[PDB]
Amino acid sequence: IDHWQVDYTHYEDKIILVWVETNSGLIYAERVKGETGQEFRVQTMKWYAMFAPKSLQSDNGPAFVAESTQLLMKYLGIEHTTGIPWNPQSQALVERTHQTLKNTLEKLIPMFNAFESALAGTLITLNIKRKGGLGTSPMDIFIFNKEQQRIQQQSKSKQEKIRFCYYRTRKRGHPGEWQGPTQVLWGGDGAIVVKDRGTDRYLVIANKDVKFIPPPK
Amino acid sequence: WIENIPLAEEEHNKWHQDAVSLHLEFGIPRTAAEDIVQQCDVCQIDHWQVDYTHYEDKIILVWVETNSGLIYAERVKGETGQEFRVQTMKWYAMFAPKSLQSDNGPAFVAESTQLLMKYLGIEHTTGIPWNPQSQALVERTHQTLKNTLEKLIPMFNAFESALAGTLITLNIKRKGGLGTSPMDIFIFNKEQQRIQQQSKSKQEKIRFCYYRTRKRGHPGEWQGPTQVLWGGDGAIVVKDRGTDRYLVIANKDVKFI
Amino acid sequence: NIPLAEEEHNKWHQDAVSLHLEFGIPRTAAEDIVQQCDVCQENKKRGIDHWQVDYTHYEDKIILVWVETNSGLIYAERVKGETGQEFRVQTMKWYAMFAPKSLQSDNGPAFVAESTQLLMKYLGIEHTTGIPWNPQSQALVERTHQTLKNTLEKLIPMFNAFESALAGTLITLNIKRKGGLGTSPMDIFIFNKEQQRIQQQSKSKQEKIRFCYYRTRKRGHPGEWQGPTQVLWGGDGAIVVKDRGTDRYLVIANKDVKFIPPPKEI
Amino acid sequence: MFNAFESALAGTLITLNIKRKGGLGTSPMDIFIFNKEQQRIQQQSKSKQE
Amino acid sequence: IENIPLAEEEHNKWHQDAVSLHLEFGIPRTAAEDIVQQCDVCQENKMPSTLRGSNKRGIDHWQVDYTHYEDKIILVWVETNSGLIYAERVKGETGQEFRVQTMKWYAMFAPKSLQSDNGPAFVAESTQLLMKYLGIEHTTGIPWNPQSQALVERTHQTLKNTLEKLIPMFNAFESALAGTLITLNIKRKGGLGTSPMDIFIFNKEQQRIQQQSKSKQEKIRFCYYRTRKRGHPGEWQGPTQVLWGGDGAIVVKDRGTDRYLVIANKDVKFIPPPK
Amino acid sequence: YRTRKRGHPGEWQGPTQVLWGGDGAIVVKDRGTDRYLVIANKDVKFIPPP
Amino acid sequence: YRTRKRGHPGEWQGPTQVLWGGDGAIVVKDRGTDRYLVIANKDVKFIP
DNA sequence: GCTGCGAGATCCGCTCCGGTG
DNA sequence: CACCGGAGCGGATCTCGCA
DNA sequence: GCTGCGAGATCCGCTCCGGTG
DNA sequence: CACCGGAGCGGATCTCGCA
């Protein structure tokens, strides 16, 4: 949630700053006069007015790696990662979004006078008009995700009781030594969710490999 | 410290509250407070109970709460059914009770009164009070209210004013233990019940969401829908229907619906 | 958390209630920070609880109407006449079942009454008599009277007693009236009261502080005692205090300090 | 504080939609998200309801 | 208790101690002491009699100071735990000479931390970098407080006395200083008649880290703990390892306090090991 | 080792065998009171067993 | 591989051989100063 | 055939009273 | 009913710095 | 985030050995 | 045979003066 990728693109000699959300696919775009760091900072101010982002991804563009831009965006309070496009997970979505937005601009620039109006209409079509599954638009999905990330859920999680348990790792059917104990993140059927103490990664383990620790009596 | 000692003397003369109560209210030593009390020869869930009483040829309707010990009193001309209906409508409007205890008095056994409580949605119980815990508190409040009315009648012009001040003293300033007045316990109970109401209401959601797995950094196709059972930091827990075991998927790879 | 809240305030300039609700700092501390900050004071004083009194006449019945500014909680009761003693009884019942912090009222005879003001000081709550000037208060109180009149006219026929009808209208306006995320005036009144009380509990219990005079040694000659300041971190043998002149953390041997109780004048 | 008047008005919009709020911290943007959330669930069946 | 305002007025006028006022007007002495605390003149003129302490610390935590004997600069190095000392004369207190002496010192022994006063050689940035270069913590004591280095001051006094007693027996002042080092390192023995050098050697043998590293194979058990107030305990707060098990008590660490703590075996329940 | 006594670190108090060694603190047996206490490493003076 | 400064990750570096493998991290040689460096697995992109 | 002592401040030992199991 | 601090009372104990 | 201690000298408490009634 | 110092052993306690 709130993970975004930034990639510069040119359409009809007009720079379009595209913001893509990896999970819900929600898209925002706007005509950009130039790739300058100050203009990108202004666009990020407007986009932070629009939304409530938590994470951001981009390539090694000079405007993105500018020290002033980094300072301003950490003043906003967001983590930054930059590098050569390497992850197909988000790269395929980014490429599909770029192709679809170019096609929709090509479709909608004749009917609309201003290019800004045309790109706004394309954003409308991609975010609200386009639907998937039971008819859920990317903007609907993003709104629901934003609603689901509010405090009173982790408040209930804090209210809930937690238990202790052992765990072992099986390799080729050979059980390992019992490790832990660690917190049971959430109890299930046949298996539970825990975290490895060494690699600090969420792990699921079968209940047969779980030694539930009795609570105090 | 010393700036509050004569002041505390003064409101003790006004109101005759408890030594430890004024101790915690004003930061004044409890030994001094108990010397003040001894020197003062004047002094020396939403469950409710009612017992009529007589004082100076004036019937006073008294509400006694079981857990917090909160009380409410008001002068009533008589024990008539319609009069008690008026005071009990005011009572229900101005508080938020859940259950009520009452004896077999005619104003309580009255069919129209019982219909009024049922219309307002409160549970009305009529019968002889048998619980020693309830009876001891009831008699303590009765004796204390009569004593405090005897204390406060000379200063106050109005008899209703005397009852109002007595209620102030008994429910606002009179505190015990950690200095939590019965009004404070009542407020705490009300806020807690609101807390449980909202917490359970957000509890019955149990929503559903999509998910996908990661292989060597390559994307996996979206899977689901599956119930949203638990959500941690950076990832949530989802059910793999194929293998009948749970998965942990990062937030960026979970489509909530 | 308090210094970071002060930084957030001097950066963004939100309200004291805000700074409280995010950073968890005491409401009194947040209000003190707001007062100290010149930006919030140059352009725009009511605490958690502030009350306004405007009498109304509905169906030729005098009703004492109480309205609160911030949360908006209200209270009403029919009064036989406009006599100062009757308003004194009604106000003392109001104080019996409420815990006000400050009060504002018009130029009514009861509000101006010398005995009423003496009783108000007897209770020990701030009071102002004059024409209300705050646009927030004016709009809220006018809306409250209009809504109360509508509710009375809407609800009186179904209830036998006029006092019962007033009681039902109070129900509808206090507990049944609800908006936003499920916020009612009485809910938020209970809520702000509970933060207030937990703040006094924390301030009274958790903090154990000492103040001290200090001095500096130059060429072996003890200096003149200055301050006093607050012992920020107490330790065996030496203490850590802030010098007001330099605003710097300093370490002084215990042989050059005198221990003082914090409250001093306060 | 801000370099551009556009940035100033953007910040005012941010703080009025988020930072200024009331009650339990109910800002206008939060309650707009809330009533949109209520509207969408019934709008899903509004296709049949219409 | 009603005469407290008059007692405060008398205190403001005359400013006598709380004991006399308590014995005179029959007021609890706590109230009178609080009156003295909240007053001004007595607060300004009271004296801070405190005991403080010394930084004995652990093994290999030393401090040093210079010596002014016969208009000759001498460096004396003092141990705190065992009690060993060592000394050598140097022409001056320059930073480079101090660095050379410290390097010889660290060649001879294996220290861990060093304490010193505000002397320019000790405070020099190059000396601090060199101390960091050898991975040794250097802390500077508060200025104009010789009681911090009272250990080296006491050793200074003893060494000056021994020089007075031994100087005419040798040709060289350096030889006499070495003889005094022998006197105070091998001959000066008390209690069990064991030399500070022997104490230092035994400390090094115990501090040998191979045994400490290999002791990890011992069985480790977990348990809870609670705090007792007026005989009334609290909840069983937090699972922690049994660091050691003794007769009637164990050793546990509280993550809340981040320090070691002891609980009697009565308030301890043993967690069975995996089986 | 030394205890708090009247105030601050006190005078050295008797010989007693160390029970176990940790990082920054050890455990000793109090002869006077017959209770186990925790003492920081700043106030301990290790001695050979005889 | 990339290094983290005050919690901020740096630009990716390489390609370089994997020197010594551990638990949750890898050891790599710095091409500039010619020294081995330890990098967490989250800051390393394995080249297949 | 002469000569260190006492205000001042915390801590503690303690004893009736208290909560406390 | 036994038990431990709580508060009050009383005594025990520390450095310091005066000439 | 920091910090008075120990050589030296008599006296005494004491425990087996002594004189001692 | 009990009793008290006698002598030896061990510990308790005092000022001082170093920087």
Coordinates of all heavy atoms in Angstrom, one line a residue, chain A residues 103-144:
Chain A
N103 N -2.0 5.4 -25.5 CA -3.1 5.1 -26.3 C -4.3 5.9 -26.0 O -5.0 6.4 -26.9 CB -3.5 3.6 -26.2 CG -4.6 3.1 -27.1 OD1 -4.7 3.7 -28.2 ND2 -5.3 2.1 -26.7
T104 N -4.6 6.1 -24.7 CA -5.8 6.9 -24.3 C -5.6 8.4 -24.6 O -6.6 9.0 -25.0 CB -6.1 6.7 -22.8 OG1 -4.9 6.9 -22.0 CG2 -6.6 5.3 -22.6
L105 N -4.4 8.9 -24.4 CA -4.2 10.3 -24.9 C -4.4 10.4 -26.4 O -5.0 11.3 -26.9 CB -2.8 10.8 -24.5 CG -2.5 11.4 -23.2 CD1 -3.3 12.7 -23.1 CD2 -2.8 10.5 -22.0
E106 N -3.9 9.4 -27.2 CA -4.1 9.4 -28.6 C -5.6 9.4 -28.9 O -6.1 10.0 -29.9 CB -3.4 8.3 -29.3 CG -3.3 8.4 -30.8 CD -2.3 9.4 -31.3 OE1 -1.5 9.8 -30.5 OE2 -2.4 9.9 -32.4
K107 N -6.4 8.6 -28.2 CA -7.8 8.5 -28.4 C -8.5 9.9 -28.0 O -9.4 10.3 -28.8 CB -8.4 7.4 -27.5 CG -8.0 6.0 -28.0 CD -8.6 4.9 -27.1 CE -8.2 3.5 -27.5 NZ -8.8 2.5 -26.7
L108 N -8.1 10.5 -27.0 CA -8.9 11.6 -26.4 C -8.4 13.0 -26.7 O -9.1 13.9 -26.3 CB -9.0 11.4 -24.9 CG -9.9 10.2 -24.4 CD1 -9.9 10.1 -22.9 CD2 -11.3 10.3 -24.9
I109 N -7.3 13.2 -27.3 CA -6.8 14.5 -27.6 C -7.7 15.2 -28.7 O -7.8 16.4 -28.7 CB -5.3 14.5 -28.0 CG1 -5.0 13.5 -29.1 CG2 -4.5 14.4 -26.8 CD1 -3.6 13.6 -29.5
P110 N -8.3 14.5 -29.7 CA -9.2 15.2 -30.6 C -10.4 15.8 -30.0 O -10.8 16.9 -30.3 CB -9.5 14.1 -31.7 CG -8.4 13.1 -31.5 CD -8.2 13.1 -30.1
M111 N -11.0 15.0 -29.1 CA -12.3 15.4 -28.5 C -12.2 16.6 -27.5 O -13.2 17.3 -27.3 CB -13.0 14.3 -27.9 CG -13.5 13.2 -28.8 SD -14.3 11.8 -28.0 CE -14.6 10.7 -29.3
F112 N -11.0 16.8 -26.9 CA -10.8 17.8 -25.9 C -9.9 18.9 -26.5 O -8.9 18.6 -27.2 CB -10.2 17.2 -24.6 CG -11.2 16.3 -23.9 CD1 -10.7 15.4 -22.9 CD2 -12.5 16.3 -24.2 CE1 -11.6 14.6 -22.2 CE2 -13.4 15.5 -23.5 CZ -13.0 14.6 -22.5
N113 N -10.2 20.1 -26.1 CA -9.4 21.2 -26.6 C -8.0 21.3 -26.0 O -7.0 21.2 -26.7 CB -10.1 22.6 -26.3 CG -9.6 23.7 -27.2 OD1 -8.5 23.6 -27.8 ND2 -10.4 24.8 -27.2
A114 N -7.9 21.4 -24.7 CA -6.7 21.5 -24.0 C -6.0 20.1 -23.7 O -6.7 19.1 -23.5 CB -6.8 22.2 -22.6
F115 N -4.7 20.1 -23.9 CA -4.0 18.8 -23.6 C -4.1 18.4 -22.1 O -4.1 17.2 -21.8 CB -2.5 18.9 -24.0 CG -1.7 17.7 -23.8 CD1 -1.8 16.6 -24.6 CD2 -0.8 17.6 -22.7 CE1 -1.1 15.5 -24.4 CE2 -0.1 16.5 -22.5 CZ -0.2 15.4 -23.4
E116 N -4.2 19.4 -21.2 CA -4.4 19.1 -19.8 C -5.8 18.5 -19.6 O -5.9 17.6 -18.8 CB -4.3 20.4 -19.0 CG -2.9 21.0 -18.9 CD -2.5 21.9 -20.1 OE1 -3.3 21.9 -21.1 OE2 -1.5 22.5 -20.1
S117 N -6.8 19.0 -20.3 CA -8.1 18.4 -20.2 C -8.1 17.0 -20.8 O -8.8 16.1 -20.2 CB -9.1 19.3 -21.0 OG -8.8 19.4 -22.3
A118 N -7.4 16.8 -21.9 CA -7.3 15.4 -22.5 C -6.6 14.5 -21.5 O -7.1 13.3 -21.3 CB -6.5 15.5 -23.8
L119 N -5.5 14.9 -20.8 CA -4.9 14.0 -19.9 C -5.7 13.8 -18.6 O -5.7 12.7 -18.1 CB -3.5 14.5 -19.5 CG -3.3 15.8 -18.7 CD1 -3.3 15.6 -17.2 CD2 -2.0 16.5 -19.2
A120 N -6.5 14.8 -18.2 CA -7.4 14.6 -17.1 C -8.5 13.6 -17.5 O -8.9 12.7 -16.7 CB -8.1 15.9 -16.7
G121 N -9.0 13.6 -18.7 CA -10.0 12.7 -19.2 C -9.4 11.3 -19.2 O -10.1 10.3 -18.9
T122 N -8.2 11.1 -19.7 CA -7.5 9.8 -19.7 C -7.3 9.3 -18.3 O -7.5 8.1 -18.0 CB -6.2 9.9 -20.4 OG1 -5.3 10.8 -19.8 CG2 -6.4 10.3 -21.9
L123 N -7.0 10.2 -17.4 CA -6.9 9.8 -16.0 C -8.2 9.3 -15.4 O -8.3 8.3 -14.7 CB -6.3 10.9 -15.1 CG -4.8 11.2 -15.3 CD1 -4.5 12.5 -14.4 CD2 -4.0 10.1 -14.9
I124 N -9.3 10.0 -15.8 CA -10.6 9.6 -15.4 C -10.9 8.2 -15.9 O -11.4 7.3 -15.1 CB -11.7 10.6 -15.9 CG1 -11.6 11.9 -15.1 CG2 -13.1 10.0 -15.8 CD1 -12.2 13.1 -15.8
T125 N -10.6 8.0 -17.2 CA -10.9 6.7 -17.8 C -10.1 5.5 -17.1 O -10.7 4.5 -16.8 CB -10.7 6.7 -19.3 OG1 -9.3 7.1 -19.5 CG2 -11.6 7.6 -20.0
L126 N -8.8 5.8 -16.9 CA -8.0 4.7 -16.3 C -8.3 4.5 -14.9 O -8.2 3.3 -14.4 CB -6.5 5.1 -16.5 CG -5.8 4.7 -17.8 CD1 -5.8 3.2 -17.9 CD2 -6.5 5.4 -19.0
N127 N -8.7 5.5 -14.1 CA -8.8 5.3 -12.6 C -10.2 5.0 -12.2 O -10.4 4.1 -11.4 CB -8.3 6.6 -11.9 CG -6.9 7.0 -12.2 OD1 -6.0 6.2 -11.9 ND2 -6.7 8.1 -12.8
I128 N -11.2 5.6 -12.8 CA -12.6 5.4 -12.4 C -13.4 4.5 -13.4 O -14.0 3.6 -13.0 CB -13.3 6.8 -12.2 CG1 -12.5 7.7 -11.3 CG2 -14.7 6.6 -11.6 CD1 -13.0 9.1 -11.2
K129 N -13.2 4.8 -14.7 CA -14.0 4.1 -15.6 C -13.6 2.6 -15.7 O -14.4 1.7 -15.8 CB -13.9 4.8 -17.0 CG -14.6 6.2 -17.0 CD -16.0 6.1 -16.7 CE -16.7 7.5 -16.7 NZ -16.1 8.4 -15.6
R130 N -12.3 2.4 -15.8 CA -11.8 1.0 -15.8 C -12.0 0.3 -14.5 O -11.8 0.8 -13.4 CB -10.3 1.0 -16.1 CG -9.9 1.5 -17.5 CD -10.3 0.6 -18.6 NE -11.7 0.8 -19.1 CZ -12.1 1.8 -19.9 NH1 -11.2 2.6 -20.4 NH2 -13.3 1.9 -20.2
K131 N -12.6 -0.9 -14.7 CA -13.0 -1.7 -13.5 C -12.5 -3.2 -13.8 O -12.4 -3.6 -14.9 CB -14.5 -1.6 -13.2 CG -15.0 -0.2 -12.9 CD -16.5 -0.2 -12.7 CE -17.0 1.2 -12.3 NZ -16.9 2.2 -13.4
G132 N -12.4 -3.9 -12.7 CA -12.0 -5.3 -12.7 C -12.6 -6.1 -11.6 O -13.1 -5.5 -10.6
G133 N -12.6 -7.4 -11.8 CA -13.3 -8.3 -10.9 C -14.8 -8.1 -10.8 O -15.5 -8.1 -11.8
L134 N -15.3 -7.7 -9.6 CA -16.7 -7.5 -9.4 C -17.0 -6.0 -9.8 O -18.1 -5.6 -9.5 CB -17.1 -7.7 -8.0 CG -16.9 -9.1 -7.4 CD1 -17.1 -9.2 -5.9 CD2 -17.8 -10.1 -8.2
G135 N -16.2 -5.3 -10.6 CA -16.4 -4.0 -10.9 C -15.7 -2.9 -10.1 O -16.3 -1.8 -9.9
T136 N -14.6 -3.3 -9.5 CA -13.8 -2.4 -8.6 C -12.8 -1.6 -9.4 O -11.9 -2.2 -10.0 CB -13.2 -3.1 -7.5 OG1 -12.3 -4.1 -8.0 CG2 -14.3 -3.9 -6.7
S137 N -12.8 -0.3 -9.4 CA -11.9 0.5 -10.0 C -10.6 0.7 -9.2 O -10.6 0.5 -8.0 CB -12.5 1.9 -10.3 OG -12.7 2.6 -9.1
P138 N -9.5 1.0 -9.8 CA -8.2 1.2 -9.1 C -8.4 2.3 -8.0 O -7.8 2.1 -6.9 CB -7.2 1.6 -10.1 CG -7.7 0.9 -11.4 CD -9.2 1.0 -11.3
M139 N -9.1 3.4 -8.3 CA -9.3 4.4 -7.3 C -10.2 3.9 -6.1 O -9.9 4.2 -5.0 CB -9.9 5.6 -8.0 CG -11.3 5.5 -8.6 SD -12.7 5.5 -7.5 CE -12.7 7.2 -7.0
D140 N -11.2 3.1 -6.4 CA -11.9 2.4 -5.4 C -11.1 1.6 -4.5 O -11.2 1.6 -3.3 CB -13.1 1.6 -5.9 CG -14.2 2.5 -6.4 OD1 -14.5 3.6 -5.8 OD2 -14.9 2.1 -7.4
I141 N -10.2 0.8 -5.1 CA -9.3 -0.1 -4.4 C -8.3 0.7 -3.5 O -8.1 0.4 -2.3 CB -8.5 -1.0 -5.3 CG1 -9.5 -1.9 -6.1 CG2 -7.5 -1.9 -4.5 CD1 -10.3 -2.9 -5.2
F142 N -7.8 1.8 -4.0 CA -6.9 2.7 -3.3 C -7.6 3.3 -2.1 O -7.1 3.4 -1.0 CB -6.3 3.7 -4.2 CG -5.3 4.6 -3.5 CD1 -4.0 4.2 -3.2 CD2 -5.6 5.9 -3.1 CE1 -3.1 5.0 -2.5 CE2 -4.8 6.7 -2.5 CZ -3.5 6.3 -2.2
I143 N -8.8 3.8 -2.3 CA -9.6 4.4 -1.3 C -9.9 3.4 -0.1 O -9.8 3.7 1.0 CB -10.9 5.0 -1.8 CG1 -10.6 6.3 -2.6 CG2 -11.9 5.3 -0.7 CD1 -11.8 6.8 -3.4
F144 N -10.3 2.2 -0.5 CA -10.5 1.1 0.5 C -9.3 0.8 1.3 O -9.3 0.6 2.5 CB -11.1 -0.1 -0.2 CG -11.5 -1.2 0.8 CD1 -12.6 -1.1 1.5 CD2 -10.6 -2.3 0.9 CE1 -12.9 -2.1 2.4 CE2 -11.0 -3.3 1.8 CZ -12.1 -3.2 2.5

